[PDB]
Design a protein around this nucleic acid. Sequence first.
RNA 1: CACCCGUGCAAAAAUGCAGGGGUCUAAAACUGAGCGGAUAACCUCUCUA
RNA 2: ACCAUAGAGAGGUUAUCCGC
Length: 676
Amino acid sequence: KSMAKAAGVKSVFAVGNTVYMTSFGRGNDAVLEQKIVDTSHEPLNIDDPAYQLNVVTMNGYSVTGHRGETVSAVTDNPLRRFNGRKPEQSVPTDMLCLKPTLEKKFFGKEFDDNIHIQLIYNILDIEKILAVYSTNAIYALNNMSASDFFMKRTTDETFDDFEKKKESTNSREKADFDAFEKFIGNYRLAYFADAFYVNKKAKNVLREDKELYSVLTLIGKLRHWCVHSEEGRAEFWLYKLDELKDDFKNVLDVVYNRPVEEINISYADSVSEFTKLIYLLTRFLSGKEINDLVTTLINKFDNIRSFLEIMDELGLDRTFTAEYSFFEGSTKYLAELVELNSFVKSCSFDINAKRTMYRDALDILGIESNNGLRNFIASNVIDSNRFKYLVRYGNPKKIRETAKCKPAVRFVLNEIPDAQIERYYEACCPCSANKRREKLADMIAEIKFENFRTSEAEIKRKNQAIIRLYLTVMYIMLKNLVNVNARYVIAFHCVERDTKLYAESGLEVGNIEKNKTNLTMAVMGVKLENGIIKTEFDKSFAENAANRYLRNARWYKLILDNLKKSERAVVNEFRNTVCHLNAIRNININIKEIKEVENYFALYHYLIQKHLENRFADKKVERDTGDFISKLEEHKTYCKDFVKAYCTPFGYNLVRYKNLTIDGLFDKNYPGKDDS
RNA sequence: CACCCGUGCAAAAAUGCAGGGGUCUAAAACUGAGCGGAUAACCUCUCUA
RNA sequence: ACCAUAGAGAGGUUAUCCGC
Ligand SMILES: [Mg+2]
Ligand SMILES: [Mg+2]
């Protein structure tokens, strides 16, 4: 709907006093198309020009298109982004005012252009998405314990030192080793057989402990490095993976090279350690997450290369600082990322562990008590993909009690189209769509056992149908609650990143570990005193805000009045509930008594509000949170004031704060009404 | 259908029209969920040889 | 109720194709 791109203007740039425009090409590559110098302009791309300027007014430039359909559109002047009807021309800056800092962090100097900032914001987007999938991976492993062992690993302690921790007397180190022995002893490692097992008739057997430790250490260090800022040389780790110890290099090699040798594509010898670590990360994820992850990298890195290449035509300085020189190979790392995407496939189960998953399969359905029928249930449950997802990211017995929430299943049955629910109902009881949904919800909640002249194949078809229904309903519900949680994981990742970036700028944000709201308070220029906010709203403060966000009476006021209600302990427990996914681990309890479900936002926040109410039952809470919890226990549905309260640490980025605090803006796929 | 920005026009302080945004948000383009057969190909399950 | 041999069926990967 943006006519500009159709007309062919790809990315408008400011470079000193001049402006450049680019056109799409053979891929996400770019060609520099037009130079503008105040009112003068001249073409650089002489042969096969893509588009031509109609007018060259300093305010805006209208351009017609000779490539493609002859759309004509107007493009705003980058040098006039923040100058107008308020220094008549200046290079624009990001909404966070972080540009001078990010540019001096990644490159050795400021440039007086706005090419470099777009590249850096793509590197920030690379880090943003790994924060989600690294925590989901750690969640998938931690769910098998159904003790912070996973939250703690570092790559400095090779296994030869972790072996020594076997013989320590300190209760911390005995707990650290005992958690490893308990992890190894868990049969649920068969869920990740492509990672934890090796093939050697042939047979697949559990990998040597040194390797399994090197896998846990790698995924844990990646998770820690994504979600937290790392001071010192620990920051460059993902960009200095060449400095990994040989055990981790060899685990990455032998985990990656196996399907490569099956196909022979780049063997583990020449492929980048970054690509190999991304392959390792993908093993813990669902195939949809794998596609989402790996394509996002291909994009980000292709954008990065396109800027690196067009910068050379201008003669701008391309060279990164010595530590970030990782990105100077982004052509190669793009080649390896597409080679990865050529063959990356979801992790298979251990072919022989079917007898182990059997009890999970019957537990998901609540079957306890011929056993031929019981095997017919198990085989088809376990081979499904829904069972893969539910058993990795949920607990079998916990899923069964979740299906008993009538409003939750009656809700998710609304997402299935009417005709498809008729296609599902026809298989179950051989007439309005909502009466189907109601009776089918009862037949999901109160499922007991199969069977609780008709042909044998017909009864087999009925059973297989009701199985695949139940698995699909729970798959959808769990997947959507996970992908909701991922947004707050990105949010707190960005809160932690931007704290460190503001510190380099010079804002006295202080230690954000003690209280997550401190970044918002610092950016608003308010100090809490006697433990509470004291400065009532004054217009004077809004003009002093650091970021371009806020700086308005309405939002500075709504942020301040929500922050006054934002109890620090509640915010920290919300943060931990997000980052560990404890809200959905305890799904059985957090979902009780829910009176209605309006959407996945109202369900996820009901879960969180219930968790926050279950805890803090003894630990005292101040009057406004006591009133929120009373409203929660009165209306049996999520209190909309409470979410806008404990989301206040994100307020320093208003767009995020707003998108997350109210349902109508949360999901781009389900737009809804905004609240004034 | 949210945030920000540039023009035009109300105006008496803020609307409205029409646009832009890799430098806003999971968010610049390149569209998704839906499922019927087909062998090519191998497993797995009950059911009786 | 055991063992591999051997019809039907019912699944999941796998390359080809048709519509909300
Ligand atoms: Mg540290
Ligand atoms: Mg972006």
